[PDB]
Design a protein around this ligand. Structure first.
Ligand code: 6TH
Ligand code: NAG
Ligand code: NA
Ligand code: NA
Lengths: 28, 11, 250
């Protein structure tokens, strides 16, 4: 779907979950 | 264990 | 999930629970990839060493869930299966090579705040993100330790491991259709999938477009969260041509 992977309660509201930053910091 | 689910899903 | 934490509400809206009709019990995890298609591990449906060979009418999928055991009225949705498709070269005899299956739903599920599909990777997202040290996220309702069960969905973030280290950790023959993830003994941190997490997703959030992609499927491990061991995941991109063939044909 064109909307895949964008969570209604997170990405679609520009809210981050409590640990997604740990993933981003590993993408070096 | 698991709460019974509605019977409609089991028919 | 061993050494994880409770998921936030709506944190993994592609999470699917594979549920046995009779007796009523959790069978596996799975993931929602469209309004009609659910992705899981082949061994969740077919594993002759354990006398497992499910048919469509044996099973339900439960979508939108958070609590493991509760019927989450007005939130979760329960779907019947139209058809199961197992990879034709799934190797249940030796090493779970190509441990992938699709389930088509009888009717489309309505998306909501709690129900939403994950993306499948393209070649470039897979090449960029499937690198040693890069972390993904595993979710499930499986056991909390090897030797017990969670109230709500559990989540753990784990680094992808260098292929030689994966190979050197086990006597099982590893293939290009698998990758492994987990911390090394010297890294201090812990975490793993466990029994009951089978078939659930290993996801990564692309830093290029801020979307979640399913890179792996919980496949196999020797124990759960053992030092020097790693969990093994079906390499979704490597098998995507089969996924696309099935969805295009059926
Ligand atoms: N122990 C065997 C090894 C295989 C190794 C390949 C040959 C068969 C035998 C195992 O993992 N199994 C047996 C079938 C189901 C699967 C399983 O249980 N997965 C859940 C899982 C998945 C992960 Cl990623 C990590 C741990 C676990 C739980 O063991
Ligand atoms: C699984 O069960 C089906 C019957 O629905 C059968 O046709 C098939 O051969 C079985 N597969 C194995 C590996 O036993
Ligand atoms: Na080895
Ligand atoms: Na380990």
């Amino acid at each position: 779907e064109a909307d895949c992977g964008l969570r209604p309660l997170f990405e679609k509201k520009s809210l981050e979950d409590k640990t997604e930053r740990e993933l981003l910091e590993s993408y070096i | 264990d698991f709460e019974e689910i509605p019977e409609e899903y089991l028919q | 999930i061993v050494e994880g934490s409770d998921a936030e509400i709506g944190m993994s809206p592609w999470q699917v629970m594979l549920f046995r009709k009779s007796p009523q019990e959790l069978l596996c995890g799975a993931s929602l990839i469209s309004d009609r298609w659910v992705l899981t591990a082949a061994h969740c449906l077919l594993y002759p060493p354990w006398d497992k060979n499910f048919t469509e009418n044996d099973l339900l999928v439960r979508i939108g869930k958070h609590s493991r055991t509760r019927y989450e009225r007005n939130i979760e949705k329960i779907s019947m299966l139209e058809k199961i498709y197992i990879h034709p070269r799934y190797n249940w005899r030796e090493n779970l090579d190509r441990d992938i299956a699709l389930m088509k739903l009888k009717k489309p599920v309505a998306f909501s705040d709690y129900i939403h599909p994950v993306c499948l990777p393209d070649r470039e997202t897979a090449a960029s993100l499937l690198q040693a040290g890069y972390k993904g996220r595993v979710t499930g309702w499986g056991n909390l330790k090897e030797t017990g069960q969670p109230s709500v969905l559990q989540v753990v973030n784990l680094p992808i491991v260098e292929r030689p280290v994966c190979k050197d950790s086990t006597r099982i023959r590893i293939t290009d259709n698998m990758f492994c993830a987990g911390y090394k003994p010297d890294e201090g941190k812990r975490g793993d999938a466990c029994e009951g997490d089978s078939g659930g997703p290993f996801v990564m959030k692309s830093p290029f477009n801020n979307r979640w992609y399913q890179m792996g499927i919980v496949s196999w491990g020797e124990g759960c969260d053992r030092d020097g061991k790693y969990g093994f995941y079906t390499h979704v991109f490597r098998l995507k041509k089969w996924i696309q063939k099935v969805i295009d044909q059926f």
